[PDB]
Amino acid sequence: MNQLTAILKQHTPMIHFQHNESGATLRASEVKPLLDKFILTKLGNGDIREGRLYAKKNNWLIDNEKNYALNYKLSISLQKKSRLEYLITSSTFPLPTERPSNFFTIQNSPYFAQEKCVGINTNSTIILKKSNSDPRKKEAEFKEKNWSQIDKKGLEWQDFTIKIFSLKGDLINKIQTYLPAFFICHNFGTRNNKGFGSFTVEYINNQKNICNVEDTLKENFAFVYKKKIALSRQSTLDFIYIYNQIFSTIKKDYQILKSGYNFRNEYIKSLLFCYFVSKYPNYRWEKRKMKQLIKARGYELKGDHSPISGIRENDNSWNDPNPNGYNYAYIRAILGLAEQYEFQLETPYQKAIVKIKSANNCISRYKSPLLFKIINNSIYLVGNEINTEILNKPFQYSYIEQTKNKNMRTGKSEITERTMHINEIEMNYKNRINYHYTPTSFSLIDFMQYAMSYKKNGKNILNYIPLKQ
């Protein structure tokens, strides 16, 4: 065989940056590099070096010397060009009652870029203004011109074809075995780690594929958990009602492990923070010392409750216990590196920004090591071990004060930036256990065990079934 034809079904709307073209679909420049790594990993039985030797042996490599690339041609095309366009934001807003029939929204999602697309400025796709008659309960207006000039859109297409061409028959047959598993194990598009680009294979060369999703995830990932979504009735609005629950739940569940939930009278402690208090080093997250340092200056922060120390129900304290200061570290780095910390001083129209830099330009980014997968409306949280390079690395923090001044009668704008004179902890303080340094020891499998076995009052906070630990 020389050609491989596969039909792909979409489970979540991909965030595509080239949505302008009507033929915009999954990009093969993304699929092929990941598929090459997946096949080489599978050929070597979990090791990419043995798999490359296997591909080198049977002349499957484009270059035998320096790249993982395999000698095949990949093409992804749309059969029917009718698509659904989604507005994916992290902020809830009222639905505008004038929209194209293919326009849909995911109000609460992990995708937090493009937050300006809903707001006040004329560049926003959806503009909110105070409704007449009753105050509050604003209504939204849809601007199609801003919809056109959006960088990324959530696109969902009907079944579309993947064409793989190779003059090597044995390469094609090995691709056929691994192709259904590759798409189950990977997501594509922007913010793919939160389950925005899930695809599955239906027909391989006009043959119905029977690949159990549970065991496929079991062999490829170290830990797998399953979440039972509420099987609500009225399953005719399949798109919006189901998608909104799933992505709101993912944002809920993810903002439990990383940081906590703080809305109404409902507080769940950061499971990552709880994890490090339990262990021997008794690390306290950098957020604690950030707040303490800012209070050490003449800056007062908004909050009815003092910063949380430890795990116990009420330890909202501002000062370290007594014998010496707590052990501090950059706990939140291991689950995703950020650039700024916003603290939102109580004094209105001004806030404090803490900038994170690698304290030597080595770590510029870090993808979150947790992968959320959505297949057939079932939420699977899979993952592997973290990159050990992030462990025990320094980080400089720049403390700057930003004041969003009350306009100037013309432009409604601010430029104010002031450097807060925070007494900075020395880099070599406490033998390089200060709050500048990432934790020395951390295992994701151990963390996911502790996080999803955690309990207060009753039941599990993260209602997951542990398929694989």
């Binding site: 073209e21 990009r27 420049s29 002349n59 095949y72 041609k73 992804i76 061409f165 003059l167 870090y366």
Partner: protein, 314 residues
């Protein structure tokens, strides 16, 4: 001026992309490190790219009509979306923000995007068994290369023409007649003027409702996932754009696994011991169908492995 390229109101696209791209303007700096990362340089390059990507092509274009008159009836195929790239290796890069980092293949005179006939000829030959040169470095992969390509050529020939059976020597002779215009060896066949296979330049024919050039990104992530990515912006031919392939093809006469001239085959037919089983004929139309099938199979241009340059029937 802004759209509908034509010949009276247009700016040469190759000129804009190569010579006028980096024109020195007041207040625009990209010599210094600060200038190359500045927003003013990004705005300058954004305006230049917007000027580049604003031109459409009408079906009744006098340029395309002249091409049709000069080079005959075209083979119209339509671009699908990864895009289409030609001349990616042409140096076009300074290190600034918002500029096109890869090269593009523009015709010097007309300025239209095009694929040189050498590119088409090489792409079509690469799917034939004897494209690879027998060399010391290539001798390891040489047997598998020909073995794999010969089967493909055999099925494609059986599909496009009425020939039930074709031999390896016949395929070799046909390939060397089409591309080398000789025998497999170094011998020359006495061919007439019309008995030559010519691969003209493929030109962009018609962008129905929209521009023919768009911008695309390739963003390599290095061997260290902890380091920042590298956005590379390049220029591509937009999907749903008609590409006109022009060929000058003849009829190939094979008798006893050897390529014969038209008058040679007439003389052979006139002889008494003429075995019709040993006579094979592939016409220009069947050659065009063969080339069309090859193009629909592999495509043309750069980054064809990752999808770019795939074609559909108009």
């Amino acid at each position: 001026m802004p759209k509908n390229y034509t010949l009276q109101n247009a700016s040469n696209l190759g000129w804009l992309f190569y010579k006028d791209y980096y024109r020195q303007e007041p207040n625009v700096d990209f010599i210094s490190t600060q200038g190359k990362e500045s927003d003013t340089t990004a705005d300058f390059f954004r305006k230049t790219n917007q000027r580049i990507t604003a031109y459409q092509l009408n079906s009744e274009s006098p340029l395309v009509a002249a091409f049709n008159n000069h080079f005959g009836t075209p083979l119209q195929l339509k671009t699908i979306y990864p895009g289409l790239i030609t001349g990616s290796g042409l140096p076009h890069q300074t290190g600034s923000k918002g500029e096109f980092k890869l090269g593009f293949q523009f015709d010097y005179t007309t300025g239209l995007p095009y694929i040189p006939g050498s590119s088409i000829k090489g792409t079509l030959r690469s799917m034939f068994p004897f494209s690879l040169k027998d060399k010391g470095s290539t001798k390891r992969i040489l047997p598998e290369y020909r073995k794999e390509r010969m089967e493909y050529i055999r099925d494609l020939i059986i599909e496009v023409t009425n020939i039930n059976e074709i031999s390896d020597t016949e395929i070799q002779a046909l390939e060397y007649a089409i591309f080398t215009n000789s025998t497999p060896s170094g011998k020359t066949i006495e061919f007439s003027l019309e008995e030559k296979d010519v691969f003209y330049d493929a030109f962009v024919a018609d962008s129905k409702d929209g521009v023919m050039l768009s911008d695309d990104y390739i963003t390599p992530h290095g061997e260290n996932p902890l380091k920042d990515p590298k956005p590379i912006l390049f220029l591509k031919i937009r999907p749903d754009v008609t590409i006109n392939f022009y060929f000058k093809l003849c009829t190939t006469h094979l008798y006893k696994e050897k390529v014969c001239s038209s008058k040679q085959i007439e003389e052979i037919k006139k002889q008494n011991d003429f075995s019709s089983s040993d006579y094979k004929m592939i016409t220009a139309h069947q050659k065009r169908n063969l080339f069309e099938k090859i193009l629909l199979c592999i495509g043309i241009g750069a980054k064809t492995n990752i999808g770019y340059g795939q074609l559909k029937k108009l």
